[PDB]
Amino acid sequence: AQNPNCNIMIFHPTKEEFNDFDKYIAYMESQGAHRAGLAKIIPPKEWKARETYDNISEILIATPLQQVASGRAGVFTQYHKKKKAMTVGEYRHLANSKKYQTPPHQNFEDLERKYWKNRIYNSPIYGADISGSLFDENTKQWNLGHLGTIQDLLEKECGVVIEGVNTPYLYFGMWKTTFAWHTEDMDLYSINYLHLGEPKTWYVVPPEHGQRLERLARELFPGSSRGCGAFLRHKVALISPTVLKENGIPFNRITQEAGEFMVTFPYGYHAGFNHGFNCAEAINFATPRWIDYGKMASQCSCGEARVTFSMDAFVRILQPERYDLWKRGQD
């Protein structure tokens, strides 16, 4: 078995290997990358997403989210308070303000220490989940707006034509902006490209150990657990690396820098934070290997997790028994 310790692997494809996305994902899996839940892909040196980022300031962040924490430093939840719209240029100024900027630090490790120590005492503002793309239309390789769609994958594998579309999302982050512990909708893959700015630190649990994380989460968030049998789908809970180590949960960590891709694999729980002003782009995708994960994915039916139009068909076709109850949660 390749990569039996479930380490995060880093890949350096050549320009020739960067042509065929599906084939490279399958290569990474042949080397055991999926066992970690997360892989880094450094693009060939010849590649670029677009020519410059000089003209992005007029993108609108229609609903910036203030991430308010409750709990203790290592075990907290966050809720998202909606703020007034602002442009990317306005957001970048805010991120760089004395109130919100990255503190002085020695290195990524020092910054990670400061994040875990102090995150709960601040409420950073995240421009998340903005439909759109920063890839130039002429970028032919690993262009997240030109991937094969999950609907077409399901059709190719299973023969059923379904409604739905699949488009990317932009994330504009600042210091301490945070992504809570989650897997993807329907335990899909995700791919994330850090277009610009400061890094993003990731934590991930190997898919084979996901249920260990879930069991800890039920212990640590006991009211949430009673409210919903899949409450990590709410994307609100954080658990520090110190706490994970104290409870014997297997995980790994890595920092993504501008110009790098990360891939999350089916049922790979992940969480993380941004180091400073940045912009990432991400999208879900599927492969043949995903189908069995989609069929087994947990679902939130309590009403909190509220998701896209396109998840309907996935539940309906892969999880027909669950469909009725899950749809009640959506309506």
Which chain residues interact with ligand OGA by CB under 6 A? 171, 179, 190, 192, 264, 270, 280, 282
Confirm whether residue 146 is marked as ligand binding.
no
Closest distance of CB 299 from Zn ion, Å: 8
Q: Which distant-in-sequence residues (6+ apart) come within 8 Å of 273 by Cβ? A: 115, 119, 176, 177, 178, 179, 200, 201
Which of 42, 302, 313, 317 binds Zn ion (CB under 5 A)? It is: 302
Which of 16, 58, 321, 331 binds Mg ion (CB under 5 A)? It is: 58
Task: Name the residue among 216, 207, 162 with its Cα closest to residue 184.
Answer: 207
228 contact choice in Mg ion, ligand OGA, Zn ion, none (CB below 5 to 8 Å, kind-dependent) = Zn ion
Q: Which is nearer to Zn ion, 115 or 231 (CB)?
A: 231
In DSSP terms, which residues pair with 189 in a beta bridge? 285
Q: Which is nearer to ligand OGA, 304 or 316 (CB)?
A: 304
304 contact choice in Mg ion, Ni ion, Zn ion, none (CB below 5 to 8 Å, kind-dependent) = Zn ion
272 within 8 A of 203, measured Cβ to Cβ? yes
Q: Which is nearer to Ni ion, 92 or 176 (CB)?
A: 176
Task: Name the residue among 274, 261, 287 with its Cα closest to residue 135.
Answer: 261
58 contact choice in Zn ion, Mg ion, ligand OGA, none (CB below 5 to 8 Å, kind-dependent) = Mg ion
User: What separation, in Å, do the N-terminal and C-terminal C-alpha atoms of the chain show?
Assistant: 44
42 within 8 A of 260, measured Cβ to Cβ? yes
Rounded CA gap, 135 and 191, in Å? 14
The continuous run of DSSP H or E covering 315 comes out as: helix 311-318
Confirm whether residue 302 is marked as ligand binding.
yes
Closest distance of CB 268 from ligand OGA, Å: 9
Q: Which is nearer to ligand OGA, 21 or 226 (CB)?
A: 21
179 within 8 A of 271, measured Cβ to Cβ? yes
Counting contacts by CB under 5 A, is residue 300 touching Zn ion? Answer: yes
Phi, psi (deg, nearest 5) at residue 171: -130, 120
Can you read off the two tokens belonging to residue 271? 């969480």
Task: Name the residue among 38, 3, 32 with its Cα closest to residue 254.
Answer: 38
199 within 8 A of 275, measured Cβ to Cβ? yes
Interacting stretch for Ni ion, rule CB under 5 A, among 117-125, 140-148, 187-195, 293-301? Answer: 187-195
Task: Name the residue among 265, 138, 256 with its Cα closest to residue 195.
Answer: 256
Q: Which of residues 223-252 bind Zn ion (CB under 5 A)?
A: 228
Tell me the per-residue interface mask from 67 to 96 with Ni ion, x by CB under 5 A, - otherwise: ------------------------------
Q: Which residues are annotated as a binding site for 2-oxoglutarate?
A: 126, 192, 200, 235
Q: Using CB under 5 A as the criterion, which residues of the chain lie in contact with Mg ion when the complex forms?
A: 56, 58-59
Which residues of this chain interact with Zn ion, rule CB under 5 A?
228, 300, 302, 304
Residues forming the annotated binding site for Zn(2+)? Answer: 228, 234, 300, 302
Which residues does the annotation place in the binding site? 126, 182, 184, 192, 200, 228, 234-235, 270, 300, 302
